[PDB]
Short mmCIF file of C-alpha atoms and ligand atoms in Angstrom, two decimals:
data_model
loop_
_atom_site.label_atom_id
_atom_site.label_comp_id
_atom_site.label_asym_id
_atom_site.label_seq_id
_atom_site.Cartn_x
_atom_site.Cartn_y
_atom_site.Cartn_z
CA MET Z 30 0.00 0.00 0.00
CA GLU Z 31 1.02 3.60 -0.50
CA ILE Z 32 1.68 5.25 2.83
CA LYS Z 33 3.29 8.59 3.65
CA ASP Z 34 4.21 10.68 6.67
CA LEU Z 35 2.78 14.05 5.64
CA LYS Z 36 5.02 15.75 8.20
CA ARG Z 37 8.03 14.60 6.16
CA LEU Z 38 6.60 15.74 2.81
CA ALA Z 39 6.01 19.31 3.98
CA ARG Z 40 8.15 21.86 2.15
CA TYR Z 41 7.92 25.49 1.02
CA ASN Z 42 8.59 27.41 -2.19
CA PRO Z 43 9.82 31.03 -2.07
CA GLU Z 44 8.45 31.75 -5.57
CA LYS Z 45 4.82 30.64 -5.09
CA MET Z 46 2.56 28.35 -3.08
CA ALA Z 47 3.87 24.79 -3.08
CA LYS Z 48 1.51 22.01 -4.16
CA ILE Z 49 2.77 18.70 -2.80
CA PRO Z 50 1.14 15.56 -4.26
CA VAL Z 51 0.65 12.80 -1.68
CA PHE Z 52 -1.60 10.34 -3.55
CA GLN Z 53 -3.35 10.61 -6.91
CA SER Z 54 -5.77 8.68 -9.08
CA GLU Z 55 -8.45 9.55 -11.62
CA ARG Z 56 -10.80 9.51 -8.64
CA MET Z 57 -9.04 12.10 -6.48
CA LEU Z 58 -6.11 14.38 -5.77
CA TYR Z 59 -4.79 14.22 -2.21
CA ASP Z 60 -2.33 17.09 -1.78
CA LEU Z 61 -0.61 19.32 0.72
CA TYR Z 62 -0.59 23.06 0.03
CA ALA Z 63 2.24 24.95 1.73
CA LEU Z 64 1.78 28.72 1.82
CA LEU Z 65 4.34 31.23 3.02
CA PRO Z 66 2.94 34.61 4.15
CA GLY Z 67 1.43 36.42 1.18
CA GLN Z 68 1.11 33.33 -1.00
CA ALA Z 69 -2.17 31.98 -2.32
CA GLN Z 70 -4.08 29.74 -4.63
CA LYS Z 71 -5.73 32.02 -7.13
CA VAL Z 72 -9.51 31.88 -7.31
CA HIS Z 73 -10.77 29.40 -9.83
CA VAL Z 74 -13.65 27.13 -10.79
CA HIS Z 75 -13.67 23.36 -11.27
CA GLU Z 76 -16.48 22.39 -13.64
CA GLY Z 77 -16.99 18.94 -12.15
CA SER Z 78 -14.81 18.53 -9.07
CA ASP Z 79 -15.46 19.25 -5.40
CA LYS Z 80 -12.61 20.42 -3.18
CA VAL Z 81 -12.07 20.45 0.58
CA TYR Z 82 -9.40 22.47 2.41
CA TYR Z 83 -8.30 21.32 5.88
CA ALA Z 84 -5.90 23.41 7.98
CA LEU Z 85 -3.00 21.40 9.42
CA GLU Z 86 -0.84 24.36 10.54
CA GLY Z 87 -1.25 28.12 10.54
CA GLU Z 88 -4.26 30.03 9.32
CA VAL Z 89 -5.50 31.01 5.89
CA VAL Z 90 -8.39 32.95 4.42
CA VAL Z 91 -10.52 30.63 2.31
CA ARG Z 92 -12.89 32.07 -0.29
CA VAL Z 93 -15.83 30.07 -1.61
CA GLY Z 94 -18.49 31.79 -3.67
CA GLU Z 95 -19.44 35.12 -2.08
CA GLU Z 96 -18.10 34.23 1.39
CA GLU Z 97 -14.69 34.15 3.09
CA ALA Z 98 -13.60 32.37 6.26
CA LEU Z 99 -10.57 32.20 8.51
CA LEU Z 100 -9.48 28.58 8.47
CA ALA Z 101 -7.48 27.74 11.62
CA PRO Z 102 -5.94 24.33 12.48
CA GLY Z 103 -8.60 21.62 12.69
CA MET Z 104 -11.08 23.46 10.48
CA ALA Z 105 -12.25 22.37 7.03
CA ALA Z 106 -14.10 24.22 4.26
CA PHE Z 107 -15.98 22.71 1.30
CA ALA Z 108 -15.84 24.23 -2.20
CA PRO Z 109 -18.48 22.56 -4.41
CA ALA Z 110 -17.99 22.16 -8.16
CA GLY Z 111 -18.87 25.34 -10.01
CA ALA Z 112 -18.12 27.65 -7.09
CA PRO Z 113 -15.22 30.10 -7.44
CA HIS Z 114 -12.75 29.28 -4.68
CA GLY Z 115 -9.26 30.08 -3.46
CA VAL Z 116 -7.09 30.41 -0.38
CA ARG Z 117 -4.73 33.17 0.78
CA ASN Z 118 -2.18 33.30 3.59
CA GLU Z 119 -2.70 36.79 5.03
CA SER Z 120 -0.90 35.94 8.28
CA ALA Z 121 2.73 36.48 9.27
CA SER Z 122 3.49 32.75 9.52
CA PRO Z 123 3.52 29.76 7.15
CA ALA Z 124 0.40 27.63 6.68
CA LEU Z 125 -0.03 24.00 5.65
CA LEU Z 126 -3.26 22.55 4.26
CA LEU Z 127 -4.44 19.06 3.39
CA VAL Z 128 -6.42 19.51 0.16
CA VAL Z 129 -8.63 16.93 -1.52
CA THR Z 130 -10.12 17.34 -4.99
CA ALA Z 131 -12.51 14.80 -6.51
CA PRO Z 132 -12.62 13.67 -9.13
CA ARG Z 133 -9.21 14.62 -10.53
CA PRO Z 134 -9.70 17.74 -12.70
CA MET U 21 -19.83 27.81 2.25
CA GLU U 22 -19.91 24.75 4.45
CA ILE U 23 -17.25 24.98 7.12
CA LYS U 24 -16.69 22.87 10.22
CA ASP U 25 -14.31 22.65 13.16
CA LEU U 26 -13.48 18.94 13.11
CA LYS U 27 -12.31 19.17 16.72
CA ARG U 28 -15.89 19.99 17.71
CA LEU U 29 -17.45 17.16 15.67
CA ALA U 30 -15.30 14.47 17.30
CA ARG U 31 -17.33 11.99 19.35
CA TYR U 32 -17.19 8.31 20.31
CA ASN U 33 -19.62 5.39 20.33
CA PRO U 34 -19.32 2.63 22.97
CA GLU U 35 -21.13 0.11 20.73
CA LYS U 36 -18.98 0.39 17.58
CA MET U 37 -16.69 2.69 15.63
CA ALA U 38 -18.31 6.07 15.07
CA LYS U 39 -18.52 7.40 11.51
CA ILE U 40 -18.98 11.16 11.60
CA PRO U 41 -19.98 12.81 8.30
CA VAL U 42 -18.36 16.21 7.77
CA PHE U 43 -19.17 16.93 4.11
CA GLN U 44 -20.76 14.77 1.42
CA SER U 45 -21.59 14.86 -2.27
CA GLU U 46 -21.86 12.31 -5.06
CA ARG U 47 -18.20 13.10 -5.67
CA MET U 48 -16.85 12.28 -2.21
CA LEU U 49 -17.38 11.35 1.41
CA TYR U 50 -15.36 13.41 3.89
CA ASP U 51 -15.69 11.74 7.29
CA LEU U 52 -14.14 11.37 10.71
CA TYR U 53 -13.77 7.85 12.11
CA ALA U 54 -13.56 7.68 15.90
CA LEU U 55 -12.29 4.37 17.26
CA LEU U 56 -12.17 3.38 20.90
CA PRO U 57 -9.66 0.64 21.79
CA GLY U 58 -10.70 -2.63 20.15
CA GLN U 59 -13.00 -1.02 17.59
CA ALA U 60 -12.53 -1.26 13.85
CA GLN U 61 -13.83 -0.84 10.37
CA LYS U 62 -14.29 -4.33 9.02
CA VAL U 63 -12.35 -5.22 5.90
CA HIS U 64 -14.24 -4.53 2.73
CA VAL U 65 -13.93 -3.71 -0.95
CA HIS U 66 -15.23 -0.69 -2.86
CA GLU U 67 -15.75 -1.61 -6.51
CA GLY U 68 -15.14 1.89 -7.82
CA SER U 69 -14.05 4.16 -4.98
CA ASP U 70 -10.61 5.03 -3.62
CA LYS U 71 -10.17 5.72 0.09
CA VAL U 72 -7.52 7.50 2.12
CA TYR U 73 -7.08 7.24 5.90
CA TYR U 74 -5.24 10.05 7.72
CA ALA U 75 -4.43 9.79 11.44
CA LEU U 76 -5.42 12.88 13.44
CA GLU U 77 -5.03 11.37 16.94
CA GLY U 78 -3.87 8.03 18.29
CA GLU U 79 -2.66 5.10 16.26
CA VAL U 80 -4.42 2.42 14.26
CA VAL U 81 -3.47 -0.62 12.24
CA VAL U 82 -4.51 -0.10 8.62
CA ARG U 83 -4.86 -3.08 6.30
CA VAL U 84 -4.74 -2.68 2.53
CA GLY U 85 -4.44 -5.74 0.33
CA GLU U 86 -1.83 -8.12 1.75
CA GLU U 87 -0.07 -5.48 3.87
CA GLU U 88 -0.67 -3.81 7.24
CA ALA U 89 0.77 -0.60 8.64
CA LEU U 90 0.80 1.31 11.91
CA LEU U 91 -0.74 4.68 11.13
CA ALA U 92 0.40 7.30 13.67
CA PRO U 93 -0.63 11.00 13.72
CA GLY U 94 0.36 12.76 10.51
CA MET U 95 0.47 9.58 8.44
CA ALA U 96 -1.86 8.69 5.57
CA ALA U 97 -2.54 5.41 3.77
CA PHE U 98 -4.18 4.92 0.36
CA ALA U 99 -6.64 2.08 -0.34
CA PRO U 100 -7.31 1.87 -4.10
CA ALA U 101 -10.64 0.66 -5.48
CA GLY U 102 -10.81 -3.12 -5.54
CA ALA U 103 -8.37 -3.62 -2.68
CA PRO U 104 -9.67 -5.16 0.55
CA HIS U 105 -9.09 -2.61 3.31
CA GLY U 106 -9.90 -1.89 6.92
CA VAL U 107 -8.61 -0.26 10.09
CA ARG U 108 -8.35 -1.53 13.68
CA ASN U 109 -7.53 0.24 16.94
CA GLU U 110 -5.25 -2.24 18.69
CA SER U 111 -3.91 0.39 21.10
CA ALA U 112 -5.04 1.26 24.62
CA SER U 113 -6.20 4.76 23.66
CA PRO U 114 -8.81 6.29 21.35
CA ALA U 115 -7.96 7.14 17.74
CA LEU U 116 -9.43 9.69 15.34
CA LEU U 117 -9.06 9.52 11.56
CA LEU U 118 -9.95 11.84 8.70
CA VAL U 119 -11.26 9.52 5.98
CA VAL U 120 -11.98 10.43 2.37
CA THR U 121 -13.77 8.16 -0.09
CA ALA U 122 -14.25 9.08 -3.76
CA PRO U 123 -16.53 8.86 -5.46
CA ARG U 124 -19.32 8.25 -2.94
CA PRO U 125 -19.99 4.48 -2.84
NA1 LIG P 223 2.90 9.84 -3.72
NA1 LIG P 224 -21.97 18.40 7.35
#
């Protein structure tokens, strides 16, 4: 079986938000998003995929549709297919998210 | 948007493993599994769904195919469609897992 210690996979990118693939199949993307202060995933729309952001470390501002939320460790936000969504690190510390997208875009 | 504090949703069941739905759509099941010592998710096979177990608290023994692993906090294991899989709490403390299944069985 495929098994990973997500703590070990964590890494950052000074140029832009790091997208770290953990597992992948046509059925889903299981990734880690590592955001340094000021970094973000630009707002976008997935025609037929749902996405869920879960905060592992730090805090980020998640945008889904016409609403925004402060996602702190232990919190998860759902972005249904068709809804514009994104995430921004507006804090002064790094943030790490477990992000699942299904099916694979 | 749907947003939840998973820490608040956590709960246990003395009769059997608790399955706590967080978010759900035809595209995926996003659940929390709460296992008291001795509890487990019986081994089974999903014809067309992949599943990923992520340990939030405690440790569990995950079985996928002909292999078993000790999943400690921060570790994730992938169970591809068609593979017999299950999870058992063989420790002396409770365990909490974030479990994603896609698509919804
Ligand atoms: Na991988
Ligand atoms: Na819910």
